Write a protein that binds this DNA or RNA. Sequence first.
RNA 1: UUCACAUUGUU
RNA 2: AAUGUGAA
Length: 803
Amino acid sequence: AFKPPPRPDFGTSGRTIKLQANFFEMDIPKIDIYHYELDIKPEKCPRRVNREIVEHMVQHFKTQIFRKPVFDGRKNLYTAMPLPIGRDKVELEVTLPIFKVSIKWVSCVSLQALHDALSGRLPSVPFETIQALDVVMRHLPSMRYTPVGRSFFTASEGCSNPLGGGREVWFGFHQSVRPSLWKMMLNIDVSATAFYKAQPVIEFVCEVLDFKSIEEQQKPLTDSQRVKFTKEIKGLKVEIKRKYRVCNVTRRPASHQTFPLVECTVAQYFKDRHKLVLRYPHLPCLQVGQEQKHTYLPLEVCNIVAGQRCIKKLTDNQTSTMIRATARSAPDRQEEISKLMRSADFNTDPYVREFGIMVKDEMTDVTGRVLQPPSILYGGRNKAIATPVQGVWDMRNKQFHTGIEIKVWAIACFAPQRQCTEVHLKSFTEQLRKISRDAGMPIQGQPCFCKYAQGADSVEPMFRHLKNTYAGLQLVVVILPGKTPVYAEVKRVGDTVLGMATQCVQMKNVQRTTPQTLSNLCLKINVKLGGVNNILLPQGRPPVFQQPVIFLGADVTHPPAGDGKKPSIAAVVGSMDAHPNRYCATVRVQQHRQEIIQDLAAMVRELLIQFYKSTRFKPTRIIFYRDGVSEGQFQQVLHHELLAIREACIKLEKDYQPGITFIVVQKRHHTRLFCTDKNERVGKSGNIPAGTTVDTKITHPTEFDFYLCSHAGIQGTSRPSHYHVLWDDNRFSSDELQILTYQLCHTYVRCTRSVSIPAPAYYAHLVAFRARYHLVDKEGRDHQALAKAVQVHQDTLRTMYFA
RNA sequence: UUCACAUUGUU
RNA sequence: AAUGUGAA
Ligand SMILES: [Mg+2]
Ligand SMILES: [Mg+2]
């Protein structure tokens, strides 16, 4: 239950395609790097400050110690050659315009062993070596650019990309060192993010408060303005030589604001001590440093410090500007990455030079294979077969495999009548019934109930009435004016309080209908009512379907940044037929920002029981798609969760041991794939075609992983999903697993398109999202409360309410 | 809330 | 959540 299976073989299905990857081959010497531990006192210093300290230590003690070491920013120092220190732990006094730095030799890192690991010779890739290489490649840019995670950012020279509110777009790149079947690879991608302008605080005030000039406000500021500004600058760093974090903004103007020196004002203090007359004394001051102290600084003497990323949310306009700034088609992105790498000068990096490393300035050529899409089987009387072309198909002249006959339904319109009239509702009903009839989901008549309502308060009593009054009620269609807290309430009542099927529609989609919109809407409706939209062509499925098999999807969605308290949400879905089409859901609230699904065993047990209830089979196989786990958590996650699945099986039945395949689905990596041949590009975005598969050259040297871009690239540059097999009792071959995954990408019911991840994982996402909606504004006893919030009604348990 | 894709995620 | 590109 510990180590990931070796790659069984290489895929052979599908026609070849020439690709380029944003992986750049690295030359690594055979020598041994030497690793030393570093302890810096005081120990609370920022990583930047630590790097500065070590740099200064090397420059001040260059004599008879040390030539060019690299530092990870905390406790790790690597050197290409040994240091005249042996294993001795020495204490160095470093004074920087006060720091005690102890150096103890830890170990040796053999790059030769890494060469053994990249070949077949060594079973595993030694992580210490990878980390060493990463510290090497990260040393220089960490002190030249602004490090953000594994990326680096900078103010692009010659360009200004203002966002408003004292913010601008900084451009940069993700850089990571990764082992491959081929060589060591430098993964390089371009990115952009919001940073605070390094402008005077006065101009920051002007941009925040919308002043063209500071003279627009000659008064001391309204409380609204002072608060609006306080919320913007609080937490940011300003300077005068001296760095300060802004903890507050004084209420009183600099002329009036006082402090004890006996009391003295700020304006006066800057007159007497600094010979400074304040040109804007009517404006307030910034309280900096410790908030228990009384250090107040005028706005005029302060600048926003450069290199501070905007953590706060961007406004709608700032976001629009951001997207316009960073919108790149696939070829445009390929060229920007290439331009970046050619101008990067990695091989002239003195620290890269010290460790004898060479980096190839060209993208790696890779051969992909474009898998054939599955045929999609429909129902009705004509039993049409749809053939996905470039990851897309449609439902024109097609009927659902199993269409629900709708006899009893209602309409609840929370939109104002003056905006969404009865005529609109009637026309909408006619159109929807036409489309529904075409799709094989006949809405046989008019709704038995159609009334207007207002506010969330009216939801529960209206729904309670509906459930009491109309026997055999199948659906309530809820018309919403737009973004409103009524949606969350309709879902709370419907899914968790009364167990009623709802379908919400925006007012604008009722006022102006299109065949396509109504079609997709009919997809959702048919699914919610227990229907089967379509199935994979039975004879076109891989042989895994010859025995009972269940498909599980799992995801943990986490609370937004700058948060605590809000729980993480874990969602697991399971297939309930042989198609596979129908799914059931399980969802739990859990510890804040925990990736490991805590209650997995119980969830899986539920899903297995329900599977048996639906199919009268016990799965001989369990295929588990696990979204969002990064490499650094493979071991922990697999250890807990695999054992959880096994436990769920054992407790269900003595000696019930279905084979488990554990795949990690990853969409948030930095691997990009591009068409080498321009004539292979698809659409306006110029992306690789749906079905593109890569399991060579840039993948793992020993393990079972692959890239599958299962979706059509509509806009920007596609993200090919990465699949990493952490465990496989079923002994899948690459071909069968890749084809299975791809086919699963075609079973997603909310659209007639192949999606970017297999339907189970996507459904898991939808479930966690709905749970987020159930928990809106609700976040021992509190865990019980939150658990209750996400617990769906009994009549909702066997449904696809999350569609 | 029709949907997918993509982006931001010592004063 | 925001913002874009699109679809029978
Ligand atoms: Mg997740
Ligand atoms: Mg959106």
